[PDB]
Amino acid sequence: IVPTRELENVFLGRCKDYEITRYLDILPRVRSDCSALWKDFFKAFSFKNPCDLDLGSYKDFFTSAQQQLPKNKVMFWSGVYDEAHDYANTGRKYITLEDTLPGYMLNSLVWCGQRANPGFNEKVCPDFKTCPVQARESFWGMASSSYAHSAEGEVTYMVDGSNPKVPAYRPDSFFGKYELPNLTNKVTRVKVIVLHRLGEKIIEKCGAGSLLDLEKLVKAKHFAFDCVENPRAVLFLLCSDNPNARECRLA
Amino acid sequence: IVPTRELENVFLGRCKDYEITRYLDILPRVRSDCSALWKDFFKAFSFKNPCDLDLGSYKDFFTSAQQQLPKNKVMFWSGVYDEAHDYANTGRKYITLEDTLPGYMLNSLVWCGQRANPGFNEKVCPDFKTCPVQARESFWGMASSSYAHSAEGEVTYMVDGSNPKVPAYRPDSFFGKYELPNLTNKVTRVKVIVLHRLGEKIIEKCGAGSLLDLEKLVKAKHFAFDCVENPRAVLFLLCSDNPNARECRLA
Ligand SMILES: Nc1ncnc2c1ncn2[C@@H]1O[C@H](COP(=O)(O)OP(=O)(O)OC[C@H]2OC[C@H](F)[C@@H]2O)[C@@H](O)[C@H]1O
Numbered sequence: 142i143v144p145t146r147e148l149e150n151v152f153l154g155r156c157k158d159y160e161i162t163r164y165l166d167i168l169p170r171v172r173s174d175c176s177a178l179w180k181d182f183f184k185a186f187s188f189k190n191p192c193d194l195d196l197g198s199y200k201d202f203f204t205s206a207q208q209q210l211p212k213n214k215v216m217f218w219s220g221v222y223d224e225a226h227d228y229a230n231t232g233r234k235y236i237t238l239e240d241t242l243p244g245y246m247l248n249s250l251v252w253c254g255q256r257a258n259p260g261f262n263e264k265v266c267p268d269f270k271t272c273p274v275q276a277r278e279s280f281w282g283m284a285s286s287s288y289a290h291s292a293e294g295e296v297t298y299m300v301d302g303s304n305p306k307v308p309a310y311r312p313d314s315f316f317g318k319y320e321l322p323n324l325t326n327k328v329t330r331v332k333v334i335v336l337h338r339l340g341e342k343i344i345e346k347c348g349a350g351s352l353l354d355l356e357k358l359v360k361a362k363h364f365a366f367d368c369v370e371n372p373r374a375v376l377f378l379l380c381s382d383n384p385n386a387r388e389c390r391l392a
Numbered sequence: 393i394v395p396t397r398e399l400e401n402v403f404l405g406r407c408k409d410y411e412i413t414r415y416l417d418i419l420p421r422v423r424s425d426c427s428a429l430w431k432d433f434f435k436a437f438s439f440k441n442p443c444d445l446d447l448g449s450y451k452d453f454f455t456s457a458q459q460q461l462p463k464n465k466v467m468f469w470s471g472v473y474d475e476a477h478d479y480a481n482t483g484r485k486y487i488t489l490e491d492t493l494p495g496y497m498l499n500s501l502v503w504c505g506q507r508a509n510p511g512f513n514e515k516v517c518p519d520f521k522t523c524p525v526q527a528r529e530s531f532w533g534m535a536s537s538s539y540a541h542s543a544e545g546e547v548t549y550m551v552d553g554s555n556p557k558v559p560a561y562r563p564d565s566f567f568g569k570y571e572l573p574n575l576t577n578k579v580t581r582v583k584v585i586v587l588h589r590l591g592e593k594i595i596e597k598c599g600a601g602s603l604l605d606l607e608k609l610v611k612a613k614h615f616a617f618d619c620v621e622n623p624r625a626v627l628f629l630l631c632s633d634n635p636n637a638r639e640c641r642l643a
Pocket residue numbers: 216217218219220221237238239280281282284285313314315316317320
């Protein structure tokens with residue numbers, strides 16, 4: 142598994158591009174400059190083994206890179222990357238973690254530390270499914286925590302209700318692991334959206350299975366709660382890509 | 393009207409980002425590296441009056457930055473930015489000019505030359521509707537040329553059929569000015585999509601008004617031709633944002 146080339150340069154460019162042109166009316170600017178940000182990013186992991194990370198290792202970075210988030214516009218998701226991001230619409234409808242400075246810079250990149258100069262490895266990185274969990278999930282876990290923690294108002298969660306193997310809510314998804322338990326008293330409610338892929342067997346439903354569990358969980362947190370399956374706005378997205386599925390017929 | 397801060401740095405960062413992470417399986421990489429590209433970009437307009445540009449001013453730069461384009465996947469649009477780009481889905485379904493390197497680096501930026509050091513203006517740029525047409529359209533017109541020119545196979549064109557003021561096809565839209573007339577013999581056909589916004593009065597149709605004109609024009613070019621109005625795929629898109637409009641009712 143191959144590390145991202147010229148990591149430092151890509152990091153600093155994405156960062157500059159963002160600072161100056163992206164989500165301008167949508168997210169506030171961060172306060173550290175780019176080489177400030179990088180410094181902290183690099184320190185987290187450099188000069189150690191790949192597997193020598195825990196959940197505190199990028200604490201400082203996410204401290205500098207955190208942005209306050211628009212009221213009611215935070216979204217979360219599980220097993221629906223494409224559809225959740227299509228529906229969120231680059232910040233226009235909702236904010237996803239991928240829209241925030243740190244999510245945007247780091248999205249899709251592969252890196253790791255090595256003890257020998259230059260402190261990081263340009264040939265290879267280990268699966269990470271070979272590392273302890275706290276390493277494996279050092280970065281994106283802390284990312285999700287910082288994210289979830291700075292959410293205010295209403296939040297929305299999109300899930301996949303068409304999976305026999307993976308339930309809609311699972312307490313060891315990133316959502317259940319780092320996102321849900323980190324929400325603060327500033328959050329008032331959790332709107333849930335259950336995606337039911339077209340053509341494919343329906344598995345989870347509001348008020349049953351895991352979603353019954355999540356419901357209870359959320360209520361305990363002193364949050365409101367609602368849940369809907371394939372609301373029209375979402376339904377049409379799906380259909381857009383599959384306009385013949387039996388679910389898409391016109392009046 | 394305010395020029396983009398730190399132009400150079402944004403350009404170079406957007407450029408590195410693309411070079412290394414964007415459209416990897418969709419567009420080929422460019423050959424010039426980034427400060428090569430920037431040199432040609434800068435040369436084109438620096439140390440001259442904003443108003444001192446013609447159509448050849450960024451010829452070199454688009455020579456360097458041009459990429460060969462997927463067969464049949466090239467799209468054009470007029471007056472439907474949002475909808476066309478949604479439908480194109482970041483290159484997955486079609487390629488828009490905005491997905492190419494040059495389009496991507498420069499998208500949305502504001503800059504202009506000045507004669508006194510440092511060559512360009514960091515306070516203000518005149519409202520280009522004060523310049524001769526060839527200046528006003530120096531950059532994006534050339535950009536559309538080089539793009540249109542590099543198209544092969546089938547091409548698609550999306551138009552707005554719901555506008556009393558602006559007809560669906562106009563010979564002075566960038567499409568009719570730089571794109572259409574620059575299509576080469578490698579192109580075989582033009583698929584046209586007429587958007588009919590929901591709730592709003594229908595104006596143009598296939599085989600009438602400017603679309604009759606465009607049709608004939610396209611036939612003279614020895615290209616095939618078809619045209620549809622709100623195909624389902626597109627229809628659901630619109631509907632996604634406006635799920636109550638009469639047009640959107642379910643069986
Ligand atoms: N740091 C990360 N952030 C987002 N996605 C990630 C991250 N790391 C890996 N992934 C992908 O997510 C899958 C892991 O499970 P999943 O995506 O099916 O659902 P989870 O609740 O587990 O994570 C997504 C939530 O956490 C934060 C977001 F804002 C969502 O609300 C893997 O296959 C990866 O493609």
